[PDB]
């Protein structure tokens, strides 16, 4: 039929939230990652954030009652450290059907800053060209900025790219609905950190809804879950 513009911004403007697979991370989260919004974790290597950018991208693509939204991925490479054999040993731990999970996250390396700016250009076309895509996935966006601005004569320079590439981001998470995340090798900010053996913790450092405080979860051989 013919409806109104209003009803279909009723209709289509729900909470969306992906769930992270940890019950406990999510409940920091006020139930997941959100659409419409650009959510950074940032820490150390292993502290969690680049397995967080694989696990969603699979858990994205699961039903709603199971924390999904039924939707696929793209994933963005900045330092080349992508591995499908997680997005493999996950999708599994789900039950869920390899091929098809692998087939339904987009994915390409940036190789510098400008290839990296560009990429994000092209989005909007893509997500235009297939409205399934509910995630795109940024890990380690800072990198490039880093190594070609160095030093901290450089660093007002490099605040300014860097703020220019975030703020498309966030109007292409606005505009049509995605979830981003990007990932910091240190409106929504989380600090990951090492705790003890595989477990890790997970504090709000930055956002105006989300109640400020820290969680505890484990990376597993399974994908992000509650620690043991």
């Given at each position: 039929?013919?409806?109104?513009?209003?009803?279909?911004?009723?209709?289509?403007?729900?909470?969306?939230?992906?769930?992270?697979?940890?019950?406990?991370?999510?409940?920091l989260l006020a139930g997941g990652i959100e659409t419409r919004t650009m959510t950074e974790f940032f820490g150390e290597?292993?502290?969690?954030?680049?397995?967080?950018?694989?696990?969603?991208?699979?858990?994205?693509?699961?039903?709603?009652?199971?924390?999904?939204?039924?939707?696929?991925?793209?994933?963005?490479?900045?330092?080349?450290?992508?591995?499908?054999?997680?997005?493999?040993?996950?999708?599994?731990?789900?039950?869920?059907?390899?091929?098809?999970?692998?087939?339904?996250?987009?994915?390409?390396?940036?190789?510098?800053?400008?290839?990296?700016?560009?990429?994000?250009?092209?989005?909007?076309?893509?997500?235009?060209?297939?409205?399934?895509?509910?995630?795109?996935?940024?890990?380690?966006?800072?990198?490039?900025?880093?190594?070609?601005?160095?030093?901290?004569?450089?660093?007002?320079?490099?605040?300014?790219?860097?703020?220019?590439?975030?703020?498309?981001?966030?109007?292409?998470?606005?505009?049509?609905?995605?979830?981003?995340?990007?990932?910091?090798?240190?409106?929504?900010?989380?600090?990951?950190?090492?705790?003890?053996?595989?477990?890790?913790?997970?504090?709000?450092?930055?956002?105006?809804?989300?109640?400020?405080?820290?969680?505890?979860?484990?990376?597993?051989?399974?994908?992000?879950?509650?620690?043991?």
């Amino acid at each position: 039929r013919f409806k109104t513009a209003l009803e279909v911004k009723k209709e289509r403007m729900n909470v969306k939230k992906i769930s992270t697979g940890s019950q406990a991370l999510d409940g920091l989260l006020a139930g997941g990652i959100e659409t419409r919004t650009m959510t950074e974790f940032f820490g150390e290597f292993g502290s969690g954030k680049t397995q967080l950018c694989h696990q969603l991208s699979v858990n994205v693509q699961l039903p709603p009652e199971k924390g999904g939204l039924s939707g696929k991925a793209v994933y963005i490479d900045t330092e080349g450290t992508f591995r499908w054999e997680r997005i493999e040993n996950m999708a599994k731990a789900l039950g869920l059907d390899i091929d098809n999970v692998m087939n339904n996250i987009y994915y390409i390396r940036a190789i510098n800053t400008d290839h990296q700016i560009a990429i994000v250009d092209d989005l909007q076309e893509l997500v235009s060209k297939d409205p399934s895509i509910k995630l795109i996935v940024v890990d380690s966006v800072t990198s490039h900025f880093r190594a070609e601005y160095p030093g901290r004569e450089n660093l007002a320079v490099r605040q300014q790219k860097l703020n220019k590439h975030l703020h498309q981001l966030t109007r292409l998470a606005e505009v049509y609905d995605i979830a981003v995340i990007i990932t910091n090798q240190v409106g929504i900010r989380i600090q990951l950190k090492k705790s003890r053996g595989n477990r890790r913790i997970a504090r709000v450092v930055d956002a105006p809804h989300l109640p400020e405080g820290e969680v505890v979860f484990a990376l597993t051989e399974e994908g992000i879950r509650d620690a043991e």
